[PDB]
């Protein structure tokens, strides 16, 4: 769901048409951790990480 949000409200906001003084293009730095995440097994919906 991040991509529709970025395409709808982010990109028209950063570029715009004579609006939104930006002062530097945005960035999308991400961390990898190089390990496949295990999906949460069903249960009481634990609130841990």
């Amino acid at each position: 769901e991040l991509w529709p949000w970025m395409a709808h409200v982010l990109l028209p906001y950063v570029h715009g048409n004579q609006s939104s003084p930006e002062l530097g293009p945005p960035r999308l730095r991400q961390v990898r951790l190089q390990e496949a995440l295990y999906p949460d097994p069903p249960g009481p919906r634990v609130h841990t990480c």
Binding site: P39, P41, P42, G43
Partner: protein
Amino acid sequence: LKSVLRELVTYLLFLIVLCILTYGMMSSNVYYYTRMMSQLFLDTPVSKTEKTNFKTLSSMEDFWKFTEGSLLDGLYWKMQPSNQTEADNRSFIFYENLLLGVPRIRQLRVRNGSCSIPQDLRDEIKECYDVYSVSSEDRAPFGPRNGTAWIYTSEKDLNGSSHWGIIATYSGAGYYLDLSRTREETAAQVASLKKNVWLDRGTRATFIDFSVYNANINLFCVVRLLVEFPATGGVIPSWQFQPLKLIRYVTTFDFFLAACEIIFCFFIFYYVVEEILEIRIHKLHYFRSFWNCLDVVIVVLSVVAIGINIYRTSNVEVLLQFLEDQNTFPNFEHLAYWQIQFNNIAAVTVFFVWIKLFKFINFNRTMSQLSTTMSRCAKDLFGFAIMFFIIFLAYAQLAYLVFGTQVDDFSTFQECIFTQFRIILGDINFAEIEEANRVLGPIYFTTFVFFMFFILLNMFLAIINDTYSEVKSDLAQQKAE
């Protein structure tokens, strides 16, 4: 007061020793074992092609297949290539060899035909397996009566104490089966008897057990589980954790694990010396209620823990052979209950000892004044509660009689009481209350707020302040004689 000071110091030292012994009774090397037994043992996927949990059953056939797979996998240890691989070699102490000889899993059936269906309901409701109940328990085993697994008898082989839970006590009416060797009839013969549907419309609840057999001190640990069979398939499980061992001690590292505890019990023996001398000689039947709020229970405070330890150490170690040999299987009817009772008694004794030490930590003047203040006004404080409750119940009755027809908050008497308590703690609605009765509705709320809050919340603090000031003045007038 030198003798009194010495006695107080000795009592404090004895209490500290007892607390240290209680803390040592909660020693380490058991949290990891409990976590392994609760997260790996009896809780693991059947295979790598499924994502269901141990208690995530939703269909009868699926639940039966998952249970069979879990029983087949858990009855044998891992590979562990460090021996001749005779029969399920185990080389771990982490919920691995959790078999302990022949298993005994029972399945109590659900009676069908509790009540007749409607007359107009023809050919619609004929077979109706009622919920699991013990008042109408029925012996409904499989039709091919052969062996111990095809019977439905009393609880002579169930070994259950009591449940007192959601529905009623546990019922032993079922088929108690046995497990052969790991590679004999416990690896590829669980589903060989699929002709009789275990997860059919004639089952109520499946009870299973799992030992440890991976503990150095006699490997004495066995937990149980009960999965209720729903009317639409699946199973809802309920269980606990029972990881433990024997009380074997090695003098190299555990020489004083419980040696001083008997010496600590000797301190109670010292309290015995004054037990028969402080009642029948001086102050006969006087310091029993107004001053013995904690002295009376102090003598028997540690008696329960000592008795539990004696009954669990010197009385259960004789029959701790655990010689199964594929023909013997002792249940855990008394082990789990004894462990739970001992843990509860130890926790209660620890809490009581902490409270008593906090009371003994009141050697300073401020805490002693606080303790004396609340003890010299207990009768007045309890007497005022009678008037408070009388007025509260009068208002509750008035509210129930007036608004108890058109307001959901005052529908019943307990709802009225809870609503009034919520009103006290700043949770007034006043929306439907005012519109339910334009007159006598606001009057009730206003008079309640005024009278209750002002008058009674000030009587409470007036009593407390009066007794506190009296204690302070009494301690102040003691100086300079």
